[PDB]
């Protein structure tokens, strides 16, 4: 596989791993409460902290994806959990991507740290619950009865992640209003993920082909579930943020928001998985 081979070859060349208080830390249009009348009752200070919390939450979701979904799938690939893979070159490509994911985790942890330090505030990760994709991943895991199911569940969600994360990162990578440290952090991550999408897509094709029909189907079902979870706004995380900030009447508004905004996608570019599924003839 010459896709894999040269990625392995020039990783050491391309890999990312080798403040204005007047700027917002995040995009207003990615805050669910921004689209509700309660936003008009909020002070400039509260609006600002919601923007900071937004960025912190975005970083947390990304860290949770890398640590709970992506790297664990990569580790299962190297350990031989899936048929149709193997070979030295793939092991090296995946091992490389694991370094990248860990570095992305560090970049996003630092993104939050800079914000905490510069805004002079905690914005603690401990205030945030597990992100929505993390929750749904876990729910599917808990419904599994067999080890092979758990592993296929993780592959499916990871494949979705790796192939869709460019679009999630795109939401901030090109914004020139927000902090440039934030934009630049997201862009640097984005650079690595193009190559992750290729690896992940290739691996998905070959695992799918080598699996028996029952297991193939189970895998696609987890892909579907993953994509739905991945592109959704995280209403639940945003509910934790507004409760912590003591926003008057957040609970009633949050219900109104879920009603009006449920069925919208935070991530609307699904070209990654659309293209993967088209190429696979499924
Ligand atoms: Fe990453
Ligand atoms: Fe990745």
From Swiss-Prot:
It catalyses: alpha-N-dichloroacetyl-p-aminophenylserinol + AH2 + 2 O2 = chloramphenicol + A + 2 H2O. Contains a nonheme dinuclear iron cluster that stabilizes a peroxo intermediate. Its cofactor is Fe(2+). Its EC number is 1.14.99.67. Coiled coil: none annotated. GO terms for molecular function: metal ion binding; oxidoreductase activity. Pathway: Antibiotic biosynthesis. Fe cation 2 binds at residues 101, 162, 193, 196. GO terms for biological process: antibiotic biosynthetic process. It holds the Pfam family AurF. Gene3D superfamilies: Ribonucleotide Reductase, subunit A (1.10.620.20). Keywords: Antibiotic biosynthesis, Iron, Metal-binding, Oxidoreductase. Fe cation 1 binds at residues 66, 101, 104, 189, 193. Belongs to the AurF N-oxygenase family. Involved in chloramphenicol biosynthesis. Catalyzes the six-electron oxidation of an aryl-amine precursor of chloramphenicol (NH2-CAM) to yield the aryl-nitro group of chloramphenicol (CAM). During catalysis, upon exposure of the diferrous cluster to O(2), ClmI forms an exceptionally long-lived peroxo intermediate (CmlI-peroxo), which reacts with NH2-CAM to form CAM. This is Alpha-N-dichloroacetyl-p-aminophenylserinol N-oxygenase.
